[PDB]
Symmetry: C11
Subunit: 67 residues, 11 copies
């Protein structure tokens, strides 16, 4: 199953997981401080991922940056 | 399953999931504020995704941009 | 796990039309896009062909093609 | 499962689906007007596709053009 | 999910002949193409070999080849 | 499943299927005259293919030529 | 299943496994000292990994560096 | 499933199929005259193939040439 | 499964397997003397591998070096 | 399943298949003379292959050459 | 399933299988003299392979050389 790499470029970045299934809501928000990296898969419980805050992101489709 | 990356280039962008199945309707709209990124899969419940508003989108077939 | 098509409307009133899978072929849904909206649409248990009408920039795994209104 | 892209270069381009199975005949003809695009899969019901008329065609093996 | 061949007729009366899969081998269908028409034909449960007669431009996963009439 | 493309470069080329299994024998010989093309799979019944006669051959390993008699 | 390579560039780097499932929490934190390498899979129990401290990281998507 | 192409560069090239299983011996020998081509798979009954005589051979790992 | 290559660049390099499962602990420590090479899979019992000591390592993701 | 290509570069080359399982021993030694090519798979019964004698070898990882005593 | 190629560069090189399973111990040591080549899979019984002595090694990750 595929994954996303997120590197926080500032304190307070949120990596938020969205529920798989008929309904869509946030079930977890992981806080990243500056320089921390999270590598996060899609899973049985998480079919969409939202990033809030400034971070460097890598996926299979290349690099993108949130602000 | 494939996924799409959507980065909102202005406030109020909507990423809209359309129902899988014989019926087609919107089941969810995720609102993105400028500079937020959403990485969203195709799923048992979502077989088409629509984006409204200004955004930079990546998929397996490359970059495309939506404009508001 | 199926393939998908990206459609970006280059004018108002673009229609992305889904054709039914199976022995019966007909249109079952027509999605209206206005200028600059994007639809990323899979082939599905219900949709085995997709017709685009109106001016649009389309990406498939075979590359770019453009429809003209 | 594979698909063919068909872009009509004139009115009345006919995309013809041939039946899968021991018998071969057409079971559907989808006409396209100039500039419309049809992205059609091979399926449980369609194992060969014929294009009549002027059309620009993409498949996994590259581009080909039909002449009407 | 089988492979498919692309056949473009370069003259009228090209024949794309499907041969039967299985222990026995015979022609089960000849699809006749006129000049400029394109047939995209899979290998299937019933067709394990395809013969082209007449002048045609052909694409398969191993490249381009041309039949001559 | 893999296939081979055979284009006859003279009359009377044979494309010969050998039986799959513990027994090996020819079960079919498809005659090609000049300019005809056969695109033939490996199958539940054919696990080896012999070409006799002058032909241009494509497989997934590239181009090979058989030389006639 | 995919894996991530982490080389500690300073002492006390923490590679933290997050639980797979409805619940998300840290179930393990592996401490690496300077110059140690950990190569770590996604698994039945671990569906996200977090690195804290200065490290050089390789994944399928290329190289990235965490900072302390 | 993999296959080899064998082109005979002289008369009487011998393509030898070795039996798959705990035992090894040849179960079939197909002779090729000069210029003939055999395209042969690995199968339930053949798990090694030997070529005797001058032949031009292609496999997934490139070209090799047997000499008589 | 994926495997890692580890070449000891000094004596007493440790290639340590961490248990797969809810619990994470060392189950095995393989000591390599200078110049020895260990080629080691991920497996039913081992879902993370830690290298301590100076070594040259190859993974699908490319080269990395652990240092003493 | 993977296979290795072995071309003998002198008489008397041996390609030795080692048994798959907890037990490791030689179950078969195929003797090759100069110029002959063996294309051998890994199998239910053979999980390692040893080559003794001068030979030119191809595998998915590239060319390697065995040298005889 | 993958394999590794080992060419011995001097006499008495040892290619050592380590047991798959909860337990890790040797199980078999194949001695290669100079110039001999062994091509060995990962298997139900072997999940790690050690090379001791001077040898040229190829894996899917490239060339590496052990030193005695
Ligand atoms: N609960 C939704 C979440 C989702 C995934 N991808 C989306 C795309 C758009 C909107 C919502 C979603 C689902 O599993 O289908
Ligand atoms: N409910 C439709 C939604 C859909 C997916 N792709 C489409 C293409 C065109 C029109 C509708 C669609 C389906 O699951 O098949
Ligand atoms: N209902 C038809 C639709 C179709 C798909 N590809 C086509 C090509 C030509 C004509 C019809 C089709 C099918 O599922 O087979
Ligand atoms: N009914 C035929 C259609 C077909 C597919 N490919 C062909 C090639 C030649 C002739 C007919 C065909 C089949 O399913 O096999
Ligand atoms: N009925 C034969 C047709 C065939 C396929 N490939 C061939 C190659 C040679 C001769 C015959 C064939 C089969 O299914 O096997
Ligand atoms: N009956 C043999 C035919 C064959 C395939 N590949 C071969 C290679 C050599 C000799 C015979 C063969 C089989 O199916 O195994
Ligand atoms: N017992 C843990 C080991 C592990 C794998 N990857 C990790 C990443 C971080 C922390 C622990 C791990 C598991 O199988 O999941
Ligand atoms: N327990 C969560 C952990 C997780 C994986 N990826 C995520 C992305 C965002 C938030 C949480 C996660 C899950 O398996 O789904
Ligand atoms: N009967 C043997 C034939 C064989 C395949 N590859 C080999 C390599 C070496 C020696 C014999 C073999 C087997 O199926 O395993
Ligand atoms: N019987 C052993 C053969 C073997 C394969 N790979 C090896 C590597 C080293 C030593 C022995 C082996 C096994 O199947 O596992
Ligand atoms: N018996 C161990 C062998 C092993 C494979 N990879 C390793 C890495 C480190 C330590 C031991 C191992 C296992 O099957 O898991």
């Amino acid at each position: 199953s595929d994954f996303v790499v997120i590197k926080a470029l500032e304190d307070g970045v949120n990596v938020i997981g969205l529920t798989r299934g008929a309904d869509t809501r946030f079930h977890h928000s992981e806080k990243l401080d500056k320089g921390e990296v999270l590598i996060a898969q899609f899973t049985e419980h998480t079919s969409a991922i939202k990033v809030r805050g400034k971070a460097y992101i890598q996926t299979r489709h290349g690099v993108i940056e949130s602000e």
